[PDB]
Amino acid sequence: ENRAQVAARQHNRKIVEQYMHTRGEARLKRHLLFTEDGVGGLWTTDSGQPIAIRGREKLGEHAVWSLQCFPDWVWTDIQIFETQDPNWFWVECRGEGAIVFPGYPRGQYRNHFLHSFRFENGLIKEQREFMNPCEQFRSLGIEVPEVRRDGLPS
């Protein structure tokens, strides 16, 4: 069983590496790193609910949208964490690039990110992006509310 777990982890790590370094037009084929029923998306949003992209087909459509609205995006400072589960990885990184959201001024978006990658039979079954939405608000020119700190220790 260890042989099977070790083999899975080494292969899966390569897929995480490839995913995190896919840029430009290659993003339009990255849905092929997912299972047919794979899920990706953003788990930290203004609503408090994830926005999940369900299925390899919808993931490929989302990649077209993402390439338009984040046309020059790069992940940076990438740290890949294997876990005791050979099919579960975490990634800490930063990311930056233009943000071109419908109805908002063109902006520059920078943030810190955590990504979760869960695998099934050599491909990504679930990818989840976690960030601070306040920084995406800022990139869009949306006012960020401020918790009053006057009564808090400083």
Ligand X SMILES: O=C(c1ccccc1NCCN1CCOCC1)c1c(-c2ccc(O)cc2)sc2cc(O)ccc12
In angstroms, the CA 117 to CA 14 distance is: 12
The residue number whose beta carbon is nearest to ligand X equals 46
In angstroms, the CA 25 to CA 106 distance is: 21
Q: Does the footprint of ligand X cover residue 3 (CB under 6 A)?
A: no
Question: By rule CB under 6 A, what count of residues binds ligand X?
Answer: 18
In angstroms, the CA 69 to CA 102 distance is: 8
Among 8, 42, 93, 123, binds ligand X (CB under 6 A): 42
34: left (phi over 0), alpha (psi -120 to 50) or beta: beta
**How near is the Cβ of 54 to ligand X at its closest, in Å?**
11
Q: Does the footprint of ligand X cover residue 81 (CB under 6 A)?
A: no
In angstroms, the CA 153 to CA 138 distance is: 26
Q: Does the footprint of ligand X cover residue 129 (CB under 6 A)?
A: yes
Q: Does the footprint of a copy of itself cover residue 82 (CB under 8 A)?
A: yes
Residues at the contact surface with ligand X, assessed by CB under 6 A: 41-42, 45-46, 51, 53, 65-66, 70, 73, 95, 129, 133, 136, 147, 149, 152-153
